[PDB]
A paper describes a structure:
Thus far, only the FadL OM channel family has been shown to mediate transport of hydrophobics. Here we show, by using an integrated approach combining growth assays, X-ray crystallography and molecular dynamics (MD) simulations, that MAH uptake as the first step in biodegradation does occur via lateral diffusion. In the presence of TodX/CymD, robust growth is observed, providing the first direct evidence for MAH transport by FadL-type channels.
The lateral opening in TodX involves both β-strand S2 and S3, contrasting with EcFadL in which only strand S3 is involved. Strand S2 in TodX bulges outward, whereas S3 has a less pronounced kink in the same place as EcFadL. To flatten the S2 bulge, we removed seven residues that were not visible in the density of TodX, replaced a proline with alanine and inserted an alanine to connect the strands (ΔS2). To flatten the S3 kink in the ΔS2 mutant, we removed the conserved glycine residue G104 to give ΔS2S3. We determined the X-ray crystal structures of both TodX variants which showed that, as expected, the size of the lateral opening is drastically reduced as a result of the flattening of the strands, while the remainder of the mutant structures are very similar to those of wild type. The two TodX mutant channels ΔS2 and ΔS2S3 have much smaller lateral openings, while retaining overall high structural similarity to the wild-type protein. Plate growth assays with vapour-phase toluene showed background growth for the TodX and CymD lateral opening mutants, indicating that they are defective in toluene uptake. For TodX, background growth is already observed for the ΔS2 mutant, so the effect of the additional flattening of strand S3 in the ΔS2S3 variant cannot be assessed.
Numbering used by the authors: 4 to 399, 409 to 426
Write the structure that this text describes.
Amino acid sequence: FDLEGYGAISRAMGGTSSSYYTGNAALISNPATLSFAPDGNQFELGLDVVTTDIKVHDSHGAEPKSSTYAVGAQLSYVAQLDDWRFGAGLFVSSLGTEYGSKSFLSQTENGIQTSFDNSSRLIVLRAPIGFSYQATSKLTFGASVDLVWTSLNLELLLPSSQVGALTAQGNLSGGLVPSLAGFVGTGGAAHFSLSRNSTAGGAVDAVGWGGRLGLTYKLTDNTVLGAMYNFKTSVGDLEGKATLSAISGDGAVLPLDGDIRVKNFEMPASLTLGLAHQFNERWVVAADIKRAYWGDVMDSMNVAFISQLGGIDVALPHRYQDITVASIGTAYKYNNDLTLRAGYSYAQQALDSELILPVIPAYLKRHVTFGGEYDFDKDSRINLAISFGLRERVQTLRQSHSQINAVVSYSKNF
């Protein structure tokens, strides 16, 4: 879901990654770039805090606001040995909405203000084991594999009409649907809740695996070429405790308690390629094109709620498409220890969608990165980064939202 950049310096140059040293976050990016590290053993610690700013406005002007900040982190050690760089890491990141329980999105049809809450929070934990061999002096090659652990927590309200659209498109089923239609009726609402790791398991979480591999060529003595393939993150089944709760035309509430199993939530596979010409030996420039490939694997994400009274089920086809994100970045060393970086990264999806789901914000296209490094030891470096998600006005409801992302790292060398 870090479709964009990964690393404090990769984040600082428009998410570029493939054909230059991006720190140890290249494990999550292109492990073939790790052999461009200084000698010995780089040990990195990164911190990222992300403030999001969604403003859904609706049919006849009512403001639902989400001004939440998610934070992710990073810590990794890549050790030299021969050409072989052998590192590993823990990469946590976070994303979420929290609109509260006073919005129009906390209304039934009719318009009855319920107490229910709209909110979401995902936490992925990539954790790669990776390598980087220098083959010839012109070619390096790396690969990693990550253990992954996702945790999803959700508070979602659907006005009756949306439920009806779901059964009508052949998407909803399950024996609770009859049963509880006619408690919810044409002015009611259904609600789902998935609450924090209070239960040891539960939580709604899964384990799985992801993969990576890459390369690099020095076409000039001052121009590098780079390619890497990220795999579809094969997330296991999300499982935990949920509460489906049915609300009626007057505001009555039927709380129900069962287990949800979310099948087939894929992160996408992706193929990026790029260069980094250095035409001045303190004025570097890099650029990649990434294409993220969803449009493959033609199955369906299945949300199954089972309970003592019966099951509800939602099948959402995997549909989907590419996102092509052209990104460029520069890195002028104006002096010995201080490189200064900037960039931009326009993404554009192929066949679009306008699934205005306020609890699922969509990736912003035009980001604008900035940042730089200060070596204050040459064996103890530090990097920072700031990225502006230039905002969209999407319109089905009508949304507006923007991201500011802000990173740092510390790399002490050994």
